[model samples]
Target: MVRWFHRDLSGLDAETLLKGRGVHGSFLARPSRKNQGDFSLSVRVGDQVTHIRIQNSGDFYDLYGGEKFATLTELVEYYTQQQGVLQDRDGTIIHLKYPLNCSDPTSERWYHGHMSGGQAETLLQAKGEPWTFLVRESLSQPGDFVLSVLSDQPKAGPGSPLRVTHIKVMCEGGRYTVGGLETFDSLTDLVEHFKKTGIEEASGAFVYLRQPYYATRVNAADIENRVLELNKKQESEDTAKAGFWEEFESLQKQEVKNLHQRLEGQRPENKGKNRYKNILPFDHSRVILQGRDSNIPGSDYINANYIKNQLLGPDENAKTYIASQGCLEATVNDFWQMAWQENSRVIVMTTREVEKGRNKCVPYWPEVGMQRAYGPYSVTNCGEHDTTEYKLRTLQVSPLDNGDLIREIWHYQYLSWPDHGVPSEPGGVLSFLDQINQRQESLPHAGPIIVHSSAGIGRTGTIIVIDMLMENISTKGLDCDIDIQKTIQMVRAQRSGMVQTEAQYKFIYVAIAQFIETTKKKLEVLQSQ
Candidate 1:
């Protein structure tokens, strides 16, 4: 059983814990009755900084959330188990093996003063996996340790780059638990506490040895000053395209950080209408797509609460498709109403009906050749055309109140997006986007073509961002200097979170680069024709 004991710390120091991987802290005697355990813990996650504390509340220990634990071990377990409350995004709890001792010049594994989180991150990426090389640490500054609790499995992308969203860990005495669980946002943070205070690894821990190498750093000078790692020597050559991607990625991450800073002013209004607890439209750009209501007395129904929006392209450019979430059973009628009200001629579904045993979307439309009645409207499946990567279904909708009010809705479902991952190839995703573009053009001046994935942000945002950038590149050359970072920022500002994950964020760069190549060749073919 886990028990808390008073840790003796007469001889323990920061150098001892950081210098020796095995030796975490020095301890002395047990605690007395009056020795109430207390601590002020600070941690940084994503774009926010939070403080957690564990102190004695009378006879029991009080956690920051007003919860009580009998022992300090329980207190530590609470934070570590929440995996530092870094939920949803997937990551591996990677452990860094040092040169056994910091002072050792020649040894196996990484050495302190030699490795920066940035250097380690580059090494992590060379393993063939896609990474933003992103990390959070105490105060996001130099000299402070780094925390990179997120990453993707190598060679994954196109749409959902295996957002390892699963906290998929460390070993202990005959038992192991999740690891890579540390949080500190400043110079005098809990890292030192973990090291100096005695806790037990996957038992007790403390630390950040390096921060990842990204241009925008929490602490720039301190990290760049670290003794260079041997692996740094392997990277060479800086071409225009390479430089473009580097600047592009830097903007993506840095702006994302800045956007979070913008979150502090005041929570946007009108979120009370949200259907899903987690999804909401930004008050500023929430697509007031369709303000349709049932003419039936006392039965006012609408889905404006749904995260539906009008995705604008470049130059805060033309209104494109309707970006939205999959229709929940409760929102099916509202979805149809919006389709009719928006005069939407097309619908793009990126997620499968059910992925990994989880239901992604409600079948809002009827089966092939069948019809279904949803509240104020009737929906029928007229026909379907199947292609290699996507299937196109034709639907006709009419309001029950009006017999002759018929509208055709093209239901385009892209079949390649992997569950909990992205589309496997850029070609496949781009192909589907091409079909969507054709359908959009086919409709001349109709309401936004409604596009949705599961949450409407991941795959949905990706498509919108890539589509916008493709247009941006149309005006510029193959070596176009479009601001992808600014583009994605424009998106997230409109929607709470777009181009959802880092992999998805970074994938935008390559995917657009590929599209530039794809479109140029296609244009040449068309011109020759």
Candidate 2:
């Protein structure tokens, strides 16, 4: 359907909606109140809205005595693109720049909104394979949709080798049909039914549905169920690989191009500071200590990176993090220095001090109610709250030179994760995250949360991804779109090998699903009150 077309809007309502919410050159088309089958174009120009009448005279649509088109959408498309083509009698040009977009009929990713026939053909010709199909809101028809499919057989054509067929699907009485006798209650049901039987063309080849050109965007509130579907094994495959595995495998394959330079951590001086020699920090995002000896070449280098939401596209106030490896005995003082310099108030440790008789990480904080000195900084453990799955510790830090300038830090250490695998369930991890975020949010003008694991890219990456997705859903409402693979890719750009294992990847999805469920239950309880 035409996204800008409003069926029941009156002249006044159209004027009000456009003038209030639209910028200059923003426009919409609505059914005329005076004329039965005609339409009106309301555009915001300067400070006022101009209404131009579109007469539908049986065969074609036109602006009274000007250029004609087969459909209202065609007329709008022409005038909008060919700037001076549309004008008033007073020689004033009516510029239609942007459309006032409306909500989609469905939240499904297959239903691409406001895509023209030519746009669909171009996209499908470039990226689609034979028998690949997608549904879109029709440009020519206001309330109806179009099914664009790349046919199996290649045709003699000047444009694309394979023919792309556009079929109109009519919506009437809250039911969907494609000129066939069968009607379905929902668009999803209609697509499913036609997937089994090909649409007939009498003498021509039948149009079939084999695969879908799936979109990356998806609605936020619908992701819980999406996770459920992704967890199931593919229908045609007789294998253990689920949709989650496919996604993670695809991400792994793309890691070849993400192998950026890591020369800083590879330097001879900085090499001993990293817990794992090969797991180096990216040179571009690595955190550099403020005070350093000018004679020492790599004195400022640290095995850590400043990770922001790169997918947010230049958001100045986006959440930031210092993803780093577990502190080595030689670098423990450096870790505390970074915390002091960066003004970090929260430190998240996703691994235990010892696992499987191996030292995953050394105990960085002092014992409860005890004070310890690491280099020039003094750390005092105020108290500790122990839980079954995690430990929350309150620690105070101050420089020996300036004792009055003291800062408090919350150290969260998760201990339930197995040595070589993820936790069976994500409830404990989710609760631990909620508590840390609550503490982090309450602090004023705090630095990025410092997150570390054994190598900082496995469980550390997983924790960061889950928290990021949750923050997005909380801020953008439940109707926003999120792509987990893209989110992981963004993080991987900052620190390589994020979300290491496929099992860890799947665990991320499970954690998000459980979080959504718990949030829904809490919302329901509040609504009842």
Candidate with maximal lDDT: 2
Per-residue lDDT of 54 in model 2:
89
What lDDT tens digits, residue by residue, belong to model 1 across residues 1-529?
A: 1111222221133223222212111111122223444543222232222333346554565544456766444544454444444221233221211111112211111222223344544445544343322322211121122333224443355543323111111222222222435544322243234325423335333222222333211111121121122113322343334333444455455644533322211233323223455565544444443444434321223222222223332243343566777877666776776777778887889878888788778788788899989877898899988888898899998888796978888888988777655665688887787777777777777777677877787788888887776654442223222445566666666665677665675566557656756654665554421
- What value does the lDDT take at residue 386 in candidate 1? 85
Model 2 weakest 10-residue run by lDDT:
473-482
Query: Alpha carbon lDDT of residue 296, candidate 2?
Result: 96
Q: Candidates' lDDT values, in order?
A: 0.49, 0.80
Q: Per-residue lDDT for 529 in model 2?
A: 17
Per-model TM-score, in order, reads 0.48, 0.77
Q: lDDT at 461 for candidate 1?
A: 83
